[PDB]
Design a protein around this ligand. Structure first.
Ligand code: 8FR
Length: 290
């Protein structure tokens, strides 16, 4: 479809106006696959917000931009990034949301070592959001540490909904190849129909991230790693001696090769590993204070 068709379709989902009329002090802070992320100040209030800016022309699959708006429009939740408004600015989609000042989880996993209290806090938050989203039928499809945002007081929120799909009683499975390689479930790689089970697989890879510091097969080129995930028996931990049988059994319920035997989010919410889950105050001493 032509650029003006997608532009018009966006003009019907987004809010009217030019947000440049009330945002100043833009500070680039990162890139995603979909665009860039800035800090800005609101002149009306002094409050800081994050603004995600996505170029319509620079988009492989333009139709995924609707997700950037629709998820956070309909899925307010204590463990989900909260959106305020979305706007169409020239040929860029802009999404204005809260500023989560504790950065992404990736900064913590590559630069510190988390205890099981902290791992459990992150997994509890992610699972709560995933059970709300899976219930009403949404698949995130890009679960990883880069998609997890924190605050100075250890609140954990799920982000980067650019890649979501929605499954229904009509179309129940889902066939497209999206997500980050090393974190992809194997049924997704061999390109069979899949459901929310993929998020659960990817959460398991995130746990390896929190334990070993990187996902399985991170040494290899992407394509090798994917075929590895399809052929191999599942990935065998490095720091296995640091992990309790609690975490070990949890993780074993995450990385089941067959998605029918793999635990649902709402099943994992009751696993005893999550009892270890420290409060928000437990994820303060590992951002930028060590
Ligand atoms: C939407 N949103 C709401 N708050 C945020 N905060 C942040 N997001 C990102 N990222 C952007 C590029 C990466 N792909 C993923 C992380 N990096 C940060 C680094 C330092 C600080 Cl202080 C905050 C952030 C984002």
């Amino acid at each position: 479809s032509s650029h003006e068709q997608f532009r018009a379709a966006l003009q019907l989902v987004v809010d009217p106006g030019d947000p440049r009329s009330y945002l100043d002090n833009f500070i680039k802070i990162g890139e995603g696959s979909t665009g860039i992320v800035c800090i800005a100040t609101v002149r009306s209030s002094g409050k800081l917000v994050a603004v995600k800016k996505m170029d319509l022309r620079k988009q492989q699959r333009r139709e995924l931009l609707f997700n950037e708006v629709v998820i956070m429009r309909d899925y307010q939740h204590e463990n989900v990034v909260e959106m305020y408004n979305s706007y169409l600015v020239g040929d860029e989609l802009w999404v204005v949301m809260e500023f989560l000042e504790g950065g992404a989880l990736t900064d913590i996993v590559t630069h510190t070592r988390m205890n099981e209290e902290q791992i459990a806090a992150v997994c509890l938050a992610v699972l709560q959001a995933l059970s709300v989203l899976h219930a009403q039928g949404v698949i995130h499809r890009d679960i990883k540490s880069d998609s997890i945002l924190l605050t100075h007081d250890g609140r954990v929120k799920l982000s980067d909904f650019g890649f979501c799909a929605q499954v229904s009683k009509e179309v129940p499975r889902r066939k497209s190849l999206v997500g980050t390689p090393y974190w992809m479930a194997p049924e997704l790689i061999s390109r069979l129909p899949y459901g929310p089970e993929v998020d659960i697989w990817s959460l398991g890879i995130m746990v390896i991230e929190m334990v070993d510091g990187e996902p399985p097969y991170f040494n290899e080129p992407p394509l090798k790693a994917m075929k590895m995930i399809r052929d191999n028996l599942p990935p065998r931990l490095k720091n296995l001696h640091k992990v309790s049988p609690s975490l070990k059994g949890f993780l074993d319920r995450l990385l089941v090769r067959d998605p029918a035997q793999r635990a649902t989010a709402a099943e994992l919410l009751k696993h005893p590993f999550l009892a270890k889950a420290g409060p928000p105050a437990s994820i303060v001493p590992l951002m930028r204070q060590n």
